[PDB]
Symmetry: C2
């Protein structure tokens, strides 16, 4: 009766309802239609049909799979409950805000898909060991916290840089495994879910990077130089950290070198999304065309 009057007193401006009849930035409407139009749930994909394929896999291939997937789940959990949410208050338009609520939900759908996969293919002990592994792995925990430090920070442009690097780069040391297996005719239904997730992250990376460029372009030439420096600096730390994560997951299988090349291919794309030139020369980013197609 009186308790909420101080707030009313300090918020004289009117609260505004979103109006989709007037779109200040056409891109928002484009991404909204694209993202909502691409709605999906893991229950729709017959993961159960990958069982025979999953059982023929070696113990090594299964362990690697459990880990990269648990690592992907961690990233989506963060992005969905902390990342996207951290971008709302810094939006330029109300329709941009609507998009972020769609990104947060889809991230939760991505995270849930991995459990659908586990619960269909893995044993409870395997699942339990994987989540335990993700709680204790230093590289995984380190990339999670570095990203969360920015979301919990107070710089809006830096939140968008971390988000874009998480979306267009950090997931890839993990996306390599299912894409490759898919190219060898293994876990193809599981790959279908992965392709749906990539179709989403691709657009999230591009969109958030777009808002970053719009925001940073409003600063002086000199300030723009410091954000670029900060972006590359963050990429150096994330890349370094991701190289180790990758070695530990893929050394046994012996795929490490191909994953590193894929890491560099995607780092260039993440930087491009942020409006910057790539970091690695093209001849250092060779990816198999069988992996690139099944990617698309």
């Amino acid at each position: 009766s009186n308790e909420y009057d101080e707030y009313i007193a300090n918020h004289t401006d009117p609260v505004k309802a979103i109006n989709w009849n007037v779109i200040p930035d056409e891109k928002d409407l484009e991404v909204w239609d694209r993202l909502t139009g691409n709605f999906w749930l893991p229950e729709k994909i017959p993961v159960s049909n990958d069982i025979q394929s999953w059982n023929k896999m070696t113990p090594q291939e299964q362990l690697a799979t459990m880990r990269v997937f648990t690592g992907l789940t961690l990233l989506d959990t963060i992005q969905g409950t902390v990342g996207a949410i951290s971008l709302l208050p810094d939006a330029e338009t109300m329709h941009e805000e609507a998009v972020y609520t769609n990104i947060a939900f889809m991230e939760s759908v991505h995270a849930k898909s991995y459990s659908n996969i586990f619960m269909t293919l893995a044993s409870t002990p395997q699942i339990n060991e994987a989540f335990r592994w993700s709680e204790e792995n230093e590289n995984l925990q380190r990339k999670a916290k570095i990203i969360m430090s920015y979301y919990n920070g107070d710089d809006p442009l830096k939140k968008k840089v971390a988000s874009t690097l998480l979306e267009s780069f950090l997931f890839y040391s993990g996306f390599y495994l299912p894409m490759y297996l898919s190219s060898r005719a293994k876990l193809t239904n599981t790959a279908d879910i992965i392709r749906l997730i990539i179709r989403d992250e691709s657009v999230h990376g591009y969109y958030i990077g777009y808002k970053y460029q719009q925001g940073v372009k409003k600063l002086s030439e000199a300030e723009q130089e410091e954000y670029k420096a900060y972006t590359f600096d963050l990429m150096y730390d994330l890349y370094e950290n991701e190289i180790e994560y990758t070695e530990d997951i893929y050394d046994d299988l012996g795929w490490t070198e191909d994953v590193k090349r894929f890491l560099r291919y995607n780092a260039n794309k993440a930087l491009n999304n942020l409006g910057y030139e790539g970091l690695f020369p093209t001849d250092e980013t060779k990816v198999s065309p069988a992996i690139l197609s099944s990617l698309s």
Copy 2:
């Protein structure tokens, strides 16, 4: 000394990945399944087929629809970009946080649904005036600001109360009009959209209220008393304001008395969702049968 080194130090516990194979509260899973299974976009309803009945509506009706829809749009905007989101930090389980991301998203689909109807039926001037009206109407800004003072406060249980009252009560002065009109062959397709929204909001109110009940039952005897008192005081202020708002929308139509009963009817349901008895005696909540049958 990295920009993030401090954060990594202020948060020693591991970042956890959501695990859907282990569920503390089965209700979280039930609601996630019900809400995601009930997914829809306003595009799926042929609102264009309502242009005939729309034009057959009196100037007072069209005007009332415009303002009521603008008031609903405003509520979902707050709920989608601030309400559901403010609930995340206090969730008891990670699965609950996942549910809140679906709510925030669906609240945006709700806000957009109205714009869809407007663009299909109204003229740009009717639309601009409606939004101008909702920004200047003191009773609408009042409930919007009371609700937001709580979402922006630091009391988690108050956020859930405020959210449940908005979900199971504040929308209804508005849902009344589309329900009355379709029982009279007016705006029938538009009413299908309203039913889809009500189907989401009644689950939202039930769920958030359920979480409130668990949170509050973990408090001492005196605190449980105080939250119950606070819920009834707020419920009364909201109702008080809603009467004035209802009057300003329906008097020219002369439906006010029936709408007031509908308000009391849902007020009781809102308190029930928070685990308390209704505020109004049953004989004071007798809404016309046409309206309730129209909800069916």
